[PDB]
Design an enzyme around this catalytic site. Structure first.
Site, PDB file in Angstrom:
ATOM      1  NE  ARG A 135     -21.261  38.346  43.519  1.00  0.00           N
ATOM      2  CZ  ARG A 135     -20.104  38.524  44.152  1.00  0.00           C
ATOM      3  NH1 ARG A 135     -19.099  39.139  43.544  1.00  0.00           N
ATOM      4  NH2 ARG A 135     -19.952  38.081  45.393  1.00  0.00           N
TER       5      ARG A 135
ATOM      6  CG  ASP B 275     -35.181  42.237  44.271  1.00  0.00           C
ATOM      7  OD1 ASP B 275     -35.922  42.812  43.444  1.00  0.00           O
ATOM      8  OD2 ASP B 275     -34.470  41.252  43.977  1.00  0.00           O
TER       9      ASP B 275
HETATM   10  C1  LIG Z   1     -39.234  36.852  34.901  1.00  0.00           C
HETATM   11  S1  LIG Z   1     -37.519  36.556  35.272  1.00  0.00           S
HETATM   12  C2  LIG Z   1     -37.331  36.774  36.999  1.00  0.00           C
HETATM   13  N1  LIG Z   1     -38.413  36.945  37.774  1.00  0.00           N
HETATM   14  C3  LIG Z   1     -38.308  37.109  39.081  1.00  0.00           C
HETATM   15  N2  LIG Z   1     -37.127  37.110  39.675  1.00  0.00           N
HETATM   16  C4  LIG Z   1     -36.002  36.942  38.966  1.00  0.00           C
HETATM   17  C5  LIG Z   1     -36.073  36.767  37.590  1.00  0.00           C
HETATM   18  N3  LIG Z   1     -34.828  36.629  37.144  1.00  0.00           N
HETATM   19  C6  LIG Z   1     -34.007  36.713  38.189  1.00  0.00           C
HETATM   20  N4  LIG Z   1     -34.716  36.906  39.301  1.00  0.00           N
HETATM   21  C7  LIG Z   1     -34.187  37.132  40.667  1.00  0.00           C
HETATM   22  O1  LIG Z   1     -33.512  38.392  40.779  1.00  0.00           O
HETATM   23  C8  LIG Z   1     -32.986  38.327  42.114  1.00  0.00           C
HETATM   24  C9  LIG Z   1     -31.908  39.401  42.271  1.00  0.00           C
HETATM   25  O2  LIG Z   1     -32.483  40.684  42.013  1.00  0.00           O
HETATM   26  C10 LIG Z   1     -32.377  36.927  42.221  1.00  0.00           C
HETATM   27  O3  LIG Z   1     -32.710  36.374  43.497  1.00  0.00           O
HETATM   28  C11 LIG Z   1     -33.105  36.151  41.120  1.00  0.00           C
HETATM   29  O4  LIG Z   1     -33.668  34.927  41.594  1.00  0.00           O
END
Ligand SMILES: CSc1ncnc2c1ncn2[C@@H]1O[C@H](CO)[C@@H](O)[C@H]1O
Ligand SMILES: CSc1ncnc2c1ncn2[C@@H]1O[C@H](CO)[C@@H](O)[C@H]1O
Ligand SMILES: [Cl-]
Ligand code: NA
Ligand code: NA
Length: 351
Positions: free
Chosen positions: A127, A309
């Site tokens: 991914r 998450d």
């Molecule tokens: C400040 S950058 C940032 N901030 C918050 N979330 C982020 C960021 N970059 C990617 N994602 C989200 O991480 C999720 C997977 O863990 C994916 O769902 C992806 O959308």
């Protein structure tokens, strides 16, 4: 319609998932397996992705964690969330996906800006993520957020929210500080957050009750805040001894050497290795927790993205149910285990 058990702030992002040819990654100068922020020469990646039949799913780290909480609590409005979106079609798509899950949300619209978007590129069993924050960066916590969050005693923010302004997380944590049963929780989110926001994070941590993070994030935290001797800064956290010293050192960033009845806990996820946590108990003594992670054949692992998450989501759900620290970790493990075994960053329907 409630009761709201958890309130979180984050960067609301729409994930665009799709399998792509290796020529795609090469054309956009992407390195398979890495997660990055879109560069100027990659700004046409999202429109170019459309020719690969992209699947739109709600994304964003904090949003993924509260969706887990909402799914487990079931009652509409069990979890609340705030972030900023753009005044575009993509913003409406994200809002709709959230409303149908029953999540209580208030998305602040930023005219002229585009809703956060993340390209989840599937290629050769890996991914590759390319995120463009857009409107997320304009988020400014509204003055009446405490009314919106009425009833919730568990607050959550990702360090990723510091990229809009650290004032949002500091305001939420400031509300919870000093109130014995109000719990502010934070995710280290990524190595760059630890360095880029060093001083704001140090202040925020003093107002934090529970800190979540993986090995790499904690290693960076330990180096930036000199939590261990320079000689140990490079030691492997795969070594229980070192992991415990790092967690115990990080706990001091939350306790400041003082002891109250408030929760003060640091949790370090370590991939397949046991989760380690350092907790300051009621009388001030520090206790270390080690929770083994159920084994899962490497052949059944689809992707580790989103595991963190989901882990946090499970932990917070369990916490709202008044479970012990070990029980909260086990629930987080169960949720993380579910998500890594299938495509997507959400819990399975059957879960
Ligand atoms: C400040 S950058 C940032 N901030 C918050 N979330 C982020 C960021 N970059 C990617 N994602 C989200 O991480 C999720 C997977 O863990 C994916 O769902 C992806 O959308
Ligand atoms: C063989 S790799 C593996 N096996 C089993 N579980 C995993 C693995 N990797 C991550 N987890 C689960 O995700 C949590 C961290 O998000 C980790 O704390 C854990 O719950
Ligand atoms: Cl987030
Ligand atoms: Na205490
Ligand atoms: Na998954």
């Amino acid at each position: 319609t409630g009761p709201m058990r958890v309130f979180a702030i984050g960067n609301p992002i729409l994930d665009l998932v799709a399998e792509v040819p290796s020529s795609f990654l090469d054309e956009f100068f992407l390195k398979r397996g890495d997660a990055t922020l879109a560069t100027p020469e990659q700004m046409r990646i999202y429109s170019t992705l459309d020719q690969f039949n992209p699947t739109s799913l709600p994304g964003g780290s904090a949003l993924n964690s509260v969706r887990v909480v909402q799914k487990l609590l079931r009652k509409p409005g069990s979890a609340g969330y705030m972030g900023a979106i753009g005044d575009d079609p993509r913003g409406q798509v994200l809002k709709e996906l959230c409303d149908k899950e029953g999540l209580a949300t208030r998305f602040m619209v930023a005219p002229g800006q585009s809703t956060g978007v993340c390209a989840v590129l599937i290629n050769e069993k890996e991914r590759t993520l390319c995120t463009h924050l857009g409107a997320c960066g304009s988020f400014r916590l509204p003055e009446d957020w405490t009314t919106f969050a009425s009833g919730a005693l568990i607050f959550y923010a990702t360090a990723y929210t510091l990229t809009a302004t650290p004032k949002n997380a500091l305001e939420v944590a400031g509300y919870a500080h000093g109130i014995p049963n109000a719990i502010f929780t934070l995710n280290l989110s990524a190595p760059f957050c630890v360095e880029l926001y060093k001083d704001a994070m140090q202040s925020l941590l003093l107002h934090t009750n529970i800190l979540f993070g993986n090995e790499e994030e904690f290693a960076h935290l330990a180096k930036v805040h000199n939590l261990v001797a320079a000689e140990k800064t490079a030691l492997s956290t795969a070594n229980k001894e070192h992991a415990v010293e790092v967690c115990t050192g990080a706990l001091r960033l939350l306790t400041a050497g003082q002891n109250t009845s408030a929760t003060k806990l640091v949790v370090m996820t370590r991939g397949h290795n046991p989760v380690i946590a350092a907790e300051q108990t009621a009388d001030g003594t520090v206790v270390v927790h080690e929770v083994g992670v159920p084994v899962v054949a490497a052949e059944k692992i689809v992707d580790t993205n989103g595991a963190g998450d989901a882990f946090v989501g499970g932990f917070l759900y369990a916490l709202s149910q008044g479970k012990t620290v070990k029980q909260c970790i086990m629930c987080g493990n169960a949720c993380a285990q579910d998500v890594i075994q299938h495509v997507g960053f959400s819990l399975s329907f059957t879960f």
